[PDB]
Amino acid sequence: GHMNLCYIDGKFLPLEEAKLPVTDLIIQRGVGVFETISTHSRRPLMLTPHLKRLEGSATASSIVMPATLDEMARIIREGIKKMGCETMVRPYITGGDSFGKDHLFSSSRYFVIFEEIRKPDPILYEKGVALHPINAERYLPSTKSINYMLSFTGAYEILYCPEGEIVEGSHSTFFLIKNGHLITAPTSRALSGTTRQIVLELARRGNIQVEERCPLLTELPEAEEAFITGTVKELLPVVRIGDQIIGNGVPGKLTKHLHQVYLSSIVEWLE
Amino acid sequence: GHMNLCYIDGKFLPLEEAKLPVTDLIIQRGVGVFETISTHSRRPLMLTPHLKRLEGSATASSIVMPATLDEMARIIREGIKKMGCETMVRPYITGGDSFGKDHLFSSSRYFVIFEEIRKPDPILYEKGVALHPINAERYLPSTKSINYMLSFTGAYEILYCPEGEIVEGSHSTFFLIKNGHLITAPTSRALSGTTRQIVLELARRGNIQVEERCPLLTELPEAEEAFITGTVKELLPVVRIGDQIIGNGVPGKLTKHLHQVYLSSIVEWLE
Numbered sequence: 261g262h263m264n265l266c267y268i269d270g271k272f273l274p275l276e277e278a279k280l281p282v283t284d285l286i287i288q289r290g291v292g293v294f295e296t297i298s299t300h301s302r303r304p305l306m307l308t309p310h311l312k313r314l315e316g317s318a319t320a321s322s323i324v325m326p327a328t329l330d331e332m333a334r335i336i337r338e339g340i341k342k343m344g345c346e347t348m349v350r351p352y353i354t355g356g357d358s359f360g361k362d363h364l365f366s367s368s369r370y371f372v373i374f375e376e377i378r379k380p381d382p383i384l385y386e387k388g389v390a391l392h393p394i395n396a397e398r399y400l401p402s403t404k405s406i407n408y409m410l411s412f413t414g415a416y417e418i419l420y421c422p423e424g425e426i427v428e429g430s431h432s433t434f435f436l437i438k439n440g441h442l443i444t445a446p447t448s449r450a451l452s453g454t455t456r457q458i459v460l461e462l463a464r465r466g467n468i469q470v471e472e473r474c475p476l477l478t479e480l481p482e483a484e485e486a487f488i489t490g491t492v493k494e495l496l497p498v499v500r501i502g503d504q505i506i507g508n509g510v511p512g513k514l515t516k517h518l519h520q521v522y523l524s525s526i527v528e529w530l531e
Numbered sequence: 532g533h534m535n536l537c538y539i540d541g542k543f544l545p546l547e548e549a550k551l552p553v554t555d556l557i558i559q560r561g562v563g564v565f566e567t568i569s570t571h572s573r574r575p576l577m578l579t580p581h582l583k584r585l586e587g588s589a590t591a592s593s594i595v596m597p598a599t600l601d602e603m604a605r606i607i608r609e610g611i612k613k614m615g616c617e618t619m620v621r622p623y624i625t626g627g628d629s630f631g632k633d634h635l636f637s638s639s640r641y642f643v644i645f646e647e648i649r650k651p652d653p654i655l656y657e658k659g660v661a662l663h664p665i666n667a668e669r670y671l672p673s674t675k676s677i678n679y680m681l682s683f684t685g686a687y688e689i690l691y692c693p694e695g696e697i698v699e700g701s702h703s704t705f706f707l708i709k710n711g712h713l714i715t716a717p718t719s720r721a722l723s724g725t726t727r728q729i730v731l732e733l734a735r736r737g738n739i740q741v742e743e744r745c746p747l748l749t750e751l752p753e754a755e756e757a758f759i760t761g762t763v764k765e766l767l768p769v770v771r772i773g774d775q776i777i778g779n780g781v782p783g784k785l786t787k788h789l790h791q792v793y794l795s796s797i798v799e800w801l802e
């Protein structure tokens with residue numbers, strides 16, 4: 261049950277027992293990609309878009325897939341059935357031991373972490389969160405790499421704001437609400453969020469105008485609302501960015517409305 | 532007796548046998564710092580400067596040191612003795628399993644890789660190497676982190692050239708030579724290379740003028756020579772940067788002079 265698992269070397273292990281060889285370039289060189297897959301009603305949300313993003317992350321990184329996507333789906337479904345609870349699933353693809361003379365990681369490893377889902381505390385949805393702007397970007401923005409060093413080094417999350425242009429969180433898509441419009445960075449600059457996609461579909465159905473541009477930090481004084489999106493956090497209101505209050509400093513009407521519509525509609529994106 | 536080693540969990544293991552728990556945030560979140568220490572006639576080169584930079588990297592990354600520098604030195608010396616050969620030594624400090632409430636990694640793991648040294652092939656010193664320029668920088672450039680993903684995805688090595696200002700290689704310090712002067716990025720922008728420090732010292736003794744500035748890509752048609760530095764590679768001549776031939780396309784006079792002076796002088800930096 262609630263026992264954390266790691267699928268590795270053909271076996272479901274207890275998470276605490278799973279170990280990776282120190283020869284792996286994930287450890288030595290940060291060469292790895294991953295996903296976060298979450299469940300509602302014990303069914304994986306957006307499993308296929310997640311597994312396709314994993315393959316695109318691996319392929320863009322010159323990592324050969326160590327298993328087929330059908331094999332990764334089989335593992336993730338079996339690990340969910342073992343958990344018998346709301347599960348957060350993280351498949352990892354590693355570099356393995358060698359970057360060959362043909363410029364590929366050909367001996368990639370994989371493993372799959374299964375944990376009980378840990379939603380953000382209700383207080384954070386009620387009051388919203390603060391983001392810490394940095395003058396930095398993610399390079400390879402379509403790749404979901406294991407590199408979170410900058411995310412660590414009292415804000416909930418860092419926000420990549422290269423040259424004052426807001427792109428996205430370390431873990432999260434960023435939305436701004438300004439002159440009634442939903443503003444979010446294009447996926448030429450931000451990761452192709454699965455939550456981002458669902459919100460843009462709910463915005464379309466709600467006749468909510470979407471600008472796919474990077475909002476400037478300098479527009480934040482005129483914004484009504486902000487939120488961040490991810491499979492676990494769903495839509496989390498953002499009330500402060502650095503020392504700039506967003507709107508009236510509390511979660512806004514449209515953020516809460518899109519969150520409700522997301523929870524009402526969520527079964528349509530389950531697999 | 533002879534094998535590649537990993538010091539981990541108090542034990543010298545075979546490198547092939549050593550494993551890290553997948554819970555470690557080096558794996559999950561790229562929270563890791565390391566050094567590369569080489570031996571000359573089995574004496575560790577710049578052991579103390581390497582270990583002090585390792586402490587600098589961990590400290591700047593909010594990682595609490597899981598061992599003392601004296602304990603790391605004792606491990607590194609005992610592992611060199613066990614190898615019985617010219618060794619490349621890589622001590623790693625991990626994030627461990629958690630980032631605590633106090634915004635520190637307080638449960639850091641450490642391990643020490645010992646491998647028989649692998650110099651670049653003599654043909655690379657005779658012909659020199661090519662570098663691939665990218666419009667990107669290292670964030671927290673003073674930290675020697677495990678994050679090399681951009682070195683493989685983005686030529687012997689990538690060259691970080693944010694806004695066409697040359698900073699450094701992915702693995703190496705970059706030197707340009709123009710009218711007999713040595714040009715290299717200041718430590719305000721580049722990792723403070725130990726090989727870099729040695730070359731700057733040997734230049735000063737040689738009455739070779741040093742400019743500590745980032746050379747422009749547009750200075751490369753006017754350059755006589757270029758090389759890169761790192762503890763294993765020593766001074767590797769650079770003859771091409773993207774489409775630009777450096778000098779007359781072969782290793783230059785002053786590069787070969789500084790490499791011989793480096794090899795002649797090396798015993799003063801051994802411990």
Ligand SMILES: *Cc1c(COP(=O)(O)O)cnc(C)c1O
Nearest residue numbers: 430431432433453454455490491
């Ligand atoms: C994982 C991640 C997200 C969120 O992706 P979802 O598919 O919505 O969970 C957003 N931005 C970045 C940078 C991420 O790594």
Ligand SMILES: *Cc1c(COP(=O)(O)O)cnc(C)c1O
Nearest residue numbers: 702703704722724725726761762
């Ligand atoms: C390790 C490294 C170097 C080389 O430093 P040495 O002390 O000379 O081995 C240079 N640049 C970067 C970015 C490095 O990580």
